From a paper:
Mitochondrial ATP synthase uses the energy of the electrochemical proton gradient across the inner mitochondrial membrane to produce ATP from ADP and phosphate by rotary catalysis. ATP synthases consist of the catalytic F1 head and the Fo subcomplex in the membrane. Rotation is driven by protons flowing down the membrane gradient through the Fo subcomplex. A conserved glutamate (cGlu111 in Polytomella) serves as the c-subunit proton-binding site.
We determined the structure of a 1.6 MDa mitochondrial F1Fo ATP synthase dimer by single-particle electron cryo-microscopy. At 3.7 Å resolution, all Fo subunits, helices, loops, most sidechains and some lipids are well resolved. The best-defined region of the assembly includes subunit a, the c-ring interface and ASA 6, which was built de novo. Two prominent aqueous channels defined by subunit a and the 10-subunit c-ring rotor conduct protons to protonate and deprotonate a c-subunit glutamate in the middle of the membrane. The lumenal channel extends to a cluster of buried, closely spaced glutamates and histidines (aGlu172, aHis248, aHis252, aGlu288) that appears to serve as a local reservoir for protons to be fed to the c-ring glutamates. At aGlu288 about 20 Å below the lumenal membrane surface, the channel narrows to 4 by 5 Å and changes direction by 90° towards the c-ring. The matrix channel is defined by the N-terminal half of H5 (residues 221–239), the C-terminal half of H6 (301–312) and residues cTyr102 to cGlu111 of the outer helices of c-subunits A and J. Its deepest point is a 4 Å by 7 Å cavity next to cJGlu111, ~25 Å below the c-ring surface. The positively charged, strictly conserved aArg239 in H5 separates the lumenal and matrix channels, preventing proton leakage. The shortest distance between the lumenal and matrix channels on either side of aArg239 is ~6 Å. Our structure, in particular the small distance between channels, supports the notion that the force generated by the electrostatic field acting on the deprotonated cGlu111 gives rise to directional c-ring rotation.
Numbering used by the authors:
A (entry chain A), B (entry chain J), C (entry chain B), D (entry chain I), E (entry chain C), F (entry chain H), ...: 54 to 126
K (entry chain N): 71 to 151
L (entry chain M): 96 to 323
The structure:
Amino acid sequence: SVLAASKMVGAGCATIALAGVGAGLGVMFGSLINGAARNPNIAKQLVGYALLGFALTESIALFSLLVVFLILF
Amino acid sequence: SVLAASKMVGAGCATIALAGVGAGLGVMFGSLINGAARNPNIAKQLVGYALLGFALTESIALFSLLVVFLILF
Amino acid sequence: SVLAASKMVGAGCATIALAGVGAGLGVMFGSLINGAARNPNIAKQLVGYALLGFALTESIALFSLLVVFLILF
Amino acid sequence: SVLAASKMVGAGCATIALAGVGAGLGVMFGSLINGAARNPNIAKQLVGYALLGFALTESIALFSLLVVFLILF
Amino acid sequence: SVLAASKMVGAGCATIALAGVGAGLGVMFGSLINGAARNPNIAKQLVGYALLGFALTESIALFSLLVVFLILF
Amino acid sequence: SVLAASKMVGAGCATIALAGVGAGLGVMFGSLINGAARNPNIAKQLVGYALLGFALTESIALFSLLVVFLILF
Amino acid sequence: SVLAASKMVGAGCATIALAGVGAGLGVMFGSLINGAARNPNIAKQLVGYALLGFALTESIALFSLLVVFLILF
Amino acid sequence: SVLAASKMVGAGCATIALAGVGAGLGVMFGSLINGAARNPNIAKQLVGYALLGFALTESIALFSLLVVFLILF
Amino acid sequence: SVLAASKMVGAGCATIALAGVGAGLGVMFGSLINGAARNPNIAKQLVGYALLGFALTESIALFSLLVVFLILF
Amino acid sequence: SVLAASKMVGAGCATIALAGVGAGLGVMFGSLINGAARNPNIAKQLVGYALLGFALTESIALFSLLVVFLILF
Amino acid sequence: YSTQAKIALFGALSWILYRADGQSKAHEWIVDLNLNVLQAAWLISFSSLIPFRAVYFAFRGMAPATASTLNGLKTFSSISL
Amino acid sequence: SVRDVKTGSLPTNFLTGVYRFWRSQNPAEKPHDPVNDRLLPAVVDASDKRASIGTWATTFFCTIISCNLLGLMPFNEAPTSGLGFATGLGVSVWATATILGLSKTGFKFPGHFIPGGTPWPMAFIFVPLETISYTFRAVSLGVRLWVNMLAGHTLLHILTGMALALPFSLGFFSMVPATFGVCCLLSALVGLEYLVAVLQSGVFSILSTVYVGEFNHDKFIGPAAKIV
């Protein structure tokens, strides 16, 4: 049963997409902090823009975990 | 049946393209925040440019998941 | 028993997602320090924003270790 | 039939070129936003230069997916 | 005995998470130095914030070596 | 026929060089936009320098696809 | 004797954690130099902070070579 | 004949050095454009320095393709 | 003799730690040049600090080649 | 003869150290150009420092190709 | 303890006995029993960490109808003599 | 005659701070003239065709807290860890952000093609690429809430599933070298899981307020006679 065996190797290899997703929303949330450094008088717009980009970064995180459960289940 | 077996390994390896897509729209949405840091008086143009580049970054995300379902289904 | 064997290889390969999560919350906590460099008069808001982004970065760290224990247990 | 089997492994490995293409047009579309930060009075030239570079970045994206379908079909 | 054999391969592959942890607390301790460049008059707060983030980066370093000894022992 | 089989795996692995070529001419064309941000009064020299570096970056892109067709054909 | 054989493969794979440790204390010692660029009048504090972070980066370097000799010896 | 077979796998793996060579002369030719942004009055020296570094970057590109043909031919 | 065979695969995999060591002392020697840009009136201290960090970066380079000869010889 | 076979796989894997060496002397020669941007009145010292760091970066490039010919010849 | 509250007493104590028995009959039982002494270790710690006389006056300021006092009718323009 | 409510009680003040927060996410557009006593029949009508987004969020926020708060009560497990509840609120926001789009057009399904010229094969792929990037707005909103309450809970078994072994393989008196350091590691994840559970809701509902608030764009119908 190499069919149900070899999908376990590509199971772990599929989640390496979630490396750079983690590195993506680090610099994305890094410049949130440098963004509030310039003008914290108005920064609710910037966090209101920060939850926009995190939601579209989880549209890469779940977009890769769509494949992982497609391989497993 | 190594034909339906070995495509499961390259299934997971195909989605590693979605690593740097995640890292791509992190710095893309990082500089959105640093872009609104310089002049938040006019930043609807910049978010109006930010949804341009995200749509062309999902033209890499789906452009790699075109291959994954081509391997599976 | 290659079924319980080959999942041990993809076990270790699954945790390479936690490379860039580590690199993600480095620059995220790097710009915390450069963020307090510009105006440490008000920086409790910035650390109050820094624990926001770390919690959403652990929503990538645990989001990859959801897969590792799904492979093992 | 390892001929039609082993091309399925290099099928997925061929698309890892589309990692850095995704990371390429992130910083390319990141500096679009920082480019409109300095002078949004004239930025239609910059977006008029941004669709130049995206078209030449898709001349790497399709330039790698020329190989993937050459392996499959 | 491939059970006690194949866990030795994923043993080494599990510790590649400690690559980007090393790269994470480099830029984290890089901007400590650039953070003390702007105002070394008050920098004990910044190092008092630097030992915060290192402790939460070792909550990724040990968080990956939780898996390595779980595979070995 | 593992000779004509195993070259199909290294076929796809050879094109992963075109990941960082894509990431290379992203920051190369990112700083084109930040380069025109400082002085768009004279920027035809900079684009006249930008087509220099793209031609020498395609001397890495084709320099890796010299190997891929050497493996296939 | 695959037991004493397969630990030699994961021996080399374990030390790839020392890639990003090398990249970590590069930017850590890069910003030491940019840190002394702003105010070399007082920089013994910064090098006094630089030997702090190197000692905690060798607490990742040795923290990965704790595993390598655990696999070998 | 695994001797003439297994060198075809390491053939493709050898050219992954040309990933970061492509990413190397991207930022190298990125800062050429940002370098001409500051003072395009004198930039023939900078391009006269840019063809220096490209020639020493092709002393990594050919320095890795010295190995690939050493494996093949 | 897979014992003296499989150590040759992990031989090459062990030296990938010397990737980021190379990338580490690039930015380390990059900011040497930007460090002498701010005040070349006193830069022998900075190069006197640059040979400190290179010696501690070769304490990662040799610290990984301690393992490679331990695998071979 | 897996002894003279398996060293051909680790032959190609050994040269991946020359990826980040290429990426190392890109940013090293990138900041040469940004270094001459600030003060090209005196930049022969900076190129006189640039050939220092390239010679110590080829002490990583040859330092990895010391291993490759040790595996082959 | 009124009639309505006692129904919420053994409607939340008989939940516990329904459920703390459901932790032993499962597969990983001592993984789950030590899970709950640890999970209620923060119910203890949250009781003696947060200042309740400072969260309350924060939530007293949460609504503008209760934070700022009323200014409806000044005592002038209301007298009759 | 339900209850004599206290005037300034704690869930009265806690709730109406939350409701005036979510209502403040999508404010009405500043109108095209001064608000007179004759513009009011277009202000109450532009606040009629407006979708009541303030209560659709607070419904999906006073639930997602009070369901994930049960993940930190002892003996209990949060009901969002099932797939049948977490993406039961995942599709039903993407359902609701579609029903409005199928109401501002009058039809029950539009989606057909409008022609073009030479880039018409280029514009043929993008709207059925926007569709598959609109369809995966649903799955993204659901499973994100499903994992974060099963990710911090499948691990936290095994952190308990190892930390017990040191007072199991070794004696009960042997807590001093390692166990007290590890029992401080394990407790410091429910401190993490608390801050994920409070904030996963606050992420989930601000995504709901963005994903709906791109559909209720309207206009005023009071320009009928300006000066007289």
